[PDB]
Amino acid sequence: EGVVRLTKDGQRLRNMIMSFNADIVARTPKKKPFFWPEQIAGFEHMYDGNDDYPYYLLNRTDENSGDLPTQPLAYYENPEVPQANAYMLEAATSAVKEVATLGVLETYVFQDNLATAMRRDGEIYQSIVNDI
Amino acid sequence: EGVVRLTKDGQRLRNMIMSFNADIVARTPKKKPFFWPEQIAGFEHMYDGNDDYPYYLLNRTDENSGDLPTQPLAYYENPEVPQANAYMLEAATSAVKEVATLG
Amino acid sequence: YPYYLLNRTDENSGDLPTQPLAYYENPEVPQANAYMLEAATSAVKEVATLG
Amino acid sequence: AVNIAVREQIEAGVGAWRLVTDYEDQSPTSNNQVIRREPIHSACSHVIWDSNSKLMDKSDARHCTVIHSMSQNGWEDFAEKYDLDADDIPSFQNPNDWVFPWL
Amino acid sequence: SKLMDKSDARHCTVIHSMSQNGWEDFAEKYDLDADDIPSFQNPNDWVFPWL
Amino acid sequence: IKTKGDLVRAALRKLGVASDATLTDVEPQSMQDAVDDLEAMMAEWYQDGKGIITGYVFSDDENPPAEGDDHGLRSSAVSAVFHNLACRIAPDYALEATAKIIATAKYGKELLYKQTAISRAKRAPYPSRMPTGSGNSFANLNEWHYFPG
Amino acid sequence: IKTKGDLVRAALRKLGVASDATLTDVEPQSMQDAVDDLEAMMAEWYQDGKGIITGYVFSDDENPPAEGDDHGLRSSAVSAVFHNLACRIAPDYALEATAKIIATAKYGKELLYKQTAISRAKRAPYPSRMPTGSGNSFANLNEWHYFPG
Amino acid sequence: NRLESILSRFDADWTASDEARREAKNDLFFSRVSQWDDWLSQYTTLQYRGQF
């Protein structure tokens, strides 16, 4: 085993969580007011987004009823990236950080293994030299 | 006994808690509004996710009744990873850290 | 799906009451357990001294 | 070769070299011959050591199999170098897979 | 080639992209026929809307 | 049940007007007026395909709607149609539809639009400024950013 | 009880119409109308298999529904069906079903849909981008990520 | 013959170190090409797959 084998699960979870939150950011509808079609009938150009009016006019009366109830305005709630996703992103990042250590120089056992490989190379080279 | 025998319980509990929380993250439905099918009849394309409209129109009147009651909108509470899971994850990690000492 | 649709009407009644939604409360690990865990761990730490 | 083995050991966990003899007429090391250390890429799948070896340096191994992956022109070069019949295309166990959609 | 310095490579191909006047300059330098306009695999793309 | 006349006769039967449970007989112009009302209500529901789709077939401009034309509704839609027809034509005979009829009509309309609402609950595609992450091997096809909706 | 006529006769007995507890007798065309209403209600409930499933058998297009045709309902479904039939046909005879009948019909419909709701409460498989953990030995089979839903 | 013995030894060694070989190859692919080891579901549906 090397050093990138035991961090695979944490890294994969981190990537999946980041992708899910990016999807939440992109595909979640933004925050816009909830309007009845008759509340803004004839006033559609006021709420386009332009900055040419100092008011936001609404219709007050309806024909086959009394005045419009005009319940308090509701806005679509903003995207959140649920704190479960954020906390598990943090947990996975912490996990990869802890496991991503060759032991702590930190590369000493990997250094001694390379030293033994060098010793074997030297033995083989000595044999070849004695032979040719 | 070596050094990895006494940390097995805490490590297994840590792995199980992380797996459960990952399941919570993946399989829990996200936060989307609760709509009656008659509240958005003919307005379905407005709530797709596109940003081509400045409103969110809702139906006001119903045929065989008065106006729509239009109770305040409900959403899924976001997934939480219950603080039991997080606290016991922290406790298990602390336990493995304390026992993982050959001196 | 971008929605969570609910039925509004019932046959042998008016519209569905649709009381506010209730969720199963998350597990807590009561603070009694956590506090006594801390107290025990501390007790072992204080007595685990040969001097 | 050493750097490739180090990188694979860091990443995969295993690396390998290969020492071969060659004839050099101009500036030879000794006896009109030289020794070079060419690299082996993907030593995990291209070097198949003996299963009975119980040593890290694999000195107990009494046999070893090295799989070469070479292009066509590489195949005629190999055949000319080792005095082989380039017409007969060789075949062996595929050390590599096709999980990535390589062209 | 299995070496970083590419010393194992037995051949290499270098693609030259040069303007028209550059083409006559190259033909004069290497003693080529500038009338016969050369062509080869196009190393670069046109993803950017260059003029 | 099987034709527009049946939808009208059942609707009148529900209201207690022109039914054989009370020995009352029907007037042909009541059929004509109720068929016209049914046509208007179905057209208002349909809105040329922008509203609830029930499989109802509308008479062509050349031929006015008649009693004998098949409605074409699904077997699960007839009940809602004639209950709503009875609710709509209740004021015609100086009557108010009972609470049960109104509740049944509302339930039937809800069930009619249930499947259409499920079908129309389609998410929009990814935005036009969204990048296709490096995990997608189609990125090598120069598809670094998503197609616009 | 054992056929659609029985469900209609029981429905009417509950309503107090056409029962021998009050010496009232049956009208054949009332049977036909109530059977048609029952057929429509059952079809609306079924919603072509997308709604409550009760085992009710529907008469084919060629043969109109008959009084003697077996309903096919389960033994635990007859009560709810005829209570709802009585509730639906109460406005036909210028009557309103009592509170007990309405409550029993609601309870029966809830009980009928209980088992279907339990059966259909099936969780969706894992996301297509959810990775299979290293604890699963099937990861060696190159199944590092979950299958798409 | 020699061919049968050589292939028998190679098959024994190849099968003996199969799973370690697969894990090391996955490690190389994960740390060199991409961290999304989705051979099958990559083509079923196009969804965002970040590389962080």
**Bridge partner residues of F32 (DSSP):** none
Residues of chain F with Cβ-Cβ distance to H34 below 8 Å are: 134-135, 137
A 110-129 residues inside an 8 A Cβ radius of B: none
φ/ψ of F137, rounded to 5, equals -70, -15
G 44-73 residues inside an 8 A Cβ radius of C: none
Q: Å from A29 to nearest chain F CA?
A: 10
Q: Nearest residue on chain D to A4, judged by CA atoms?
A: D11
- Would you list the DSSP string of A4-38? SSTTHHHHHHHHHHHHHHHHHHHHS----BEE-TT
Q: Which residues of H touch F (CB under 8 A)?
A: 34-36, 38, 42, 46, 48-51
Closest Cα to residue C3, out of A21, B49, F54? B49
Question: Measured between alpha carbons, how far is H27 from A12 in angstroms, rounded to an integer?
Answer: 13
Cβ distance C1 to F121 less than 8 Å, yes or no, reads yes
Please list, in sequence order, all residues whose beta carbon lies within 8 angstroms of the beta carbon of residue D64, skipping any fewer than 6 positions away. Answer: D47, D48, D49, D50, D58
Q: b vs e for G124-144, b when ≥16 Cβ sit within 10 Å of the residue's Cβ?
A: eebbbbbbbbbeeeebeeebb
Cβ distance D100 to H29 less than 8 Å, yes or no, reads yes
Q: Which two tokens stand for residue E14?
A: 């270098």
> Which residue is associated with the tokens 């005879």?
G93
Handedness of CA H9, H15, H20, H23 (dihedral sign): positive
Please list, in sequence order, all residues whose beta carbon lies within 8 angstroms of the beta carbon of residue E49, skipping any fewer than 6 positions away. Answer: none
> Which residue is associated with the tokens 């209730």?
C22
CB atoms within 10 A of CB G61: 8
Q: Angle between the G78-89 and G99-120 helix axes, to the nearest 10 degrees?
A: 130
Question: Measured between alpha carbons, how far is E45 from F8 in angstroms, rounded to an integer?
Answer: 70
Question: Measured between alpha carbons, how far is D9 from D35 in angstroms, rounded to an integer?
Answer: 24
> Which residue is associated with the tokens 């279907």?
G116
Question: Measured between alpha carbons, how far is A97 from A108 in angstroms, rounded to an integer?
Answer: 19
Please list, in sequence order, all residues whose beta carbon lies within 8 angstroms of the beta carbon of residue F147, skipping any fewer than 6 positions away. Answer: F125, F126, F128
Burial of B84 (0-12, 13-18, 19+ CB in 10 A): middle
Question: Measured between alpha carbons, how far is F108 from F83 in angstroms, rounded to an integer?
Answer: 8
- Asked if B14 and B89 count as a contact pair (C-beta separation under 8 A), the reply is yes
3-state secondary structure H22-40: HHHHHHHHHHHCCCCCCCC
- Asked if A40 and A100 count as a contact pair (C-beta separation under 8 A), the reply is no
**CA separation, residue C27 to residues B76, F92, G29, G130 (Å):** 18, 60, 62, 25
Q: Which two tokens stand for residue A41?
A: 């009938």
Burial of H23 (0-12, 13-18, 19+ CB in 10 A): buried
Q: Nearest residue on chain E to D42, judged by CA atoms?
A: E2
| Element holding G41 (H helix, E strand) | helix G28-46
How many C-alpha atoms does A44 have within 13 Å on its Cβ side? 10
DSSP β-ladder status, D47-49 and D64-66:
antiparallel
How many C-alpha atoms does G77 have within 13 Å on its Cβ side? 18
Method used for this model?
cryo-EM
Give me the resolution in angstroms, 1 decimal.
Answer: 3.2
- Asked if F18 and G30 count as a contact pair (C-beta separation under 8 A), the reply is no
Q: Å from F106 to nearest chain C CA?
A: 7
φ/ψ of D48, rounded to 5, equals -110, 100
Cβ distance G129 to A8 less than 8 Å, yes or no, reads no
Cβ distance D77 to E10 less than 8 Å, yes or no, reads yes
- Asked if F146 and F132 count as a contact pair (C-beta separation under 8 A), the reply is yes
Cβ distance D11 to H27 less than 8 Å, yes or no, reads yes
The alpha carbon torsion through G87, G93, G96, G98 (nearest 10 deg) reads -70
Closest Cα to residue G34, out of G90, G73, G75, G99? G90
Q: b vs e for G28-56, b when ≥16 Cβ sit within 10 Å of the residue's Cβ?
A: eebbbbbbbbbbbbbbbbbbeeebbbbeb
CB atoms within 10 A of CB G27: 15
**CA separation, residue D62 to residues D65, E35, G129 (Å):** 11, 66, 45
- D48 in helix, strand or coil? strand
Cβ distance G144 to H38 less than 8 Å, yes or no, reads yes
Closest Cα to residue F139, out of D75, H50, G79, E33? H50
- Asked if C5 and F117 count as a contact pair (C-beta separation under 8 A), the reply is yes
- Asked if B56 and B33 count as a contact pair (C-beta separation under 8 A), the reply is no
Compute chain H's Rg from CA coordinates. 18
Closest Cα to residue B56, out of A46, F113, A75, F120? A75
Q: Angle between the F28-46 and F78-89 helix axes, to the nearest 10 degrees?
A: 110
Residues of chain G with Cβ-Cβ distance to B26 below 8 Å are: 126-127, 130
Question: Measured between alpha carbons, how far is D78 from D90 in angstroms, rounded to an integer?
Answer: 11
Question: Measured between alpha carbons, how far is G141 from H12 in angstroms, rounded to an integer?
Answer: 20
Q: Å from B1 to nearest chain C CA?
A: 21
How many C-alpha atoms does F144 have within 13 Å on its Cβ side? 2
